[PDB]
Amino acid sequence: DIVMTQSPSSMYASLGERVTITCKASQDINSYLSWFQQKPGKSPKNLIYRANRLVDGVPSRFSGSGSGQDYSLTISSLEYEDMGIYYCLQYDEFPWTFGGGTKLESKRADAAPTVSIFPPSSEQLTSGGASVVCFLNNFYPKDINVKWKIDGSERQNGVLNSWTDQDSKDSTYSMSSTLTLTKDEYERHNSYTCEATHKTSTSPIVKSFNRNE
């Protein structure tokens, strides 16, 4: 089958900014390429077909170009309603195949996370498990590193991370980092620290607690 690859995988952009995203086919597809936009919780909507033909009703800021293997979609002046995932689709040959998508996200000023750490609950310890939960809320950009330290030593094993989608109101991101241990292993140690680092060599945002209160 024909392989479609899109670039970039994701990008930030501001209101009014010119945005161009690209789509490459593994072989010549004779301009049989369509672009789709998808917003969270909704189905994809066709914006452009035949590489550069606008679907009826689509605003004028959208356009497409390219030929053969290389194609692009351009938003001349970004609107906030343009955020979402964009997919290209080749229909030159069945099976019609999609590109991997480009996530278009909202640019804003850098923001440090509000970090909160929570010891395992008594109820969970009674079951024999021990999840230490850390929230990093309302930060930007989405790329952030979380570092767990247990009595001063870094801990990587047993950590599960989860990242929200971009907040539609303030353009920030939030993530939870959960360190799960057995009750016995958790109670072998005293201090638990959660550290949020954005760029290297900067001081982290740190929260900690001592098991021996």
Binding site: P44, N46, P95, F98, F118, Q124, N137, L160, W163, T164
Partner: protein, 212 residues
């Protein structure tokens, strides 16, 4: 106008079978070719099947050929996708699309293919460690399948809430939810997370109380 409404999704064991339906209205369903397209949890789109306007001819990609059957009942204005020998990789949201989906897509119906047992979550309160705004938490551990609905004080605490995407832990799901409130309100005013897991027909409340 044109309506395309999918139904029939749900949880199915691998190796199982399931038939999806797409009820069409607002146009001559018997004169268009119809298609199924699916979206994986990784948010990739893939064409599933294509059928002629009369239903006599069908086309499939190799991933589903021999297992999936697209059919239609023109007298009932319904499109179908019969799935058999289901694989976990078939887990996806399934859309019916008119023709090539230039204009009309349905809203989708969700299929989960898994052997995991339906399980209600264990809900644990996350209070700050014993030492202006206060952030509280709600650990929703070990449930299956998706989804759960998390609210705080039955919805009245809507702002400053972050419910995080579920992660895989064991053969079950785990997520947490955070709520941020003025320090002048909690614990003097109660904060409780409400967790609904409809697949298990459960709705649990967990009050957040300070740690001893």
């Amino acid at each position: 106008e044109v309506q395309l409404e999918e139904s029939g999704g749900g949880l199915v064991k691998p190796g199982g079978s399931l038939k999806l339906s797409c009820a069409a209205s607002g146009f001559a369903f018997s004169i268009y070719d119809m298609s199924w397209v699916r979206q994986t949890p990784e948010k990739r789109l893939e064409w599933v099947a294509y059928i002629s306007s009369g239903g006599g001819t069908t086309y499939y990609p190799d991933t589903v050929k021999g297992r999936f059957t697209i059919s239609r009942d023109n007298a009932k204005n319904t499109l179908y996708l019969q799935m058999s020998s289901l694989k976990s990789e078939d887990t996806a949201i399934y859309y019916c699309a008119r023709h090539a989906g230039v204009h009309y897509w349905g809203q989708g119906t969700t299929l989960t293919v898994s052997s995991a047992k339906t399980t209600p979550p264990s809900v644990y309160p996350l209070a700050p460690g014993s030492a202006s705004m206060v952030t509280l938490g709600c650990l929703v551990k070990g449930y299956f399948p998706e989804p759960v609905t998390v609210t705080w004080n039955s919805g009245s605490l809507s702002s400053g809430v972050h419910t995080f995407p579920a992660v895989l832990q064991s053969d079950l799901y785990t997520l947490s939810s955070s709520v941020t409130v003025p320090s002048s309100t909690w614990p003097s005013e109660t904060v409780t997370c409400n967790v609904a897991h409809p697949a298990s027909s459960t709705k649990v409340d967990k009050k957040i109380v300070p740690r001893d």
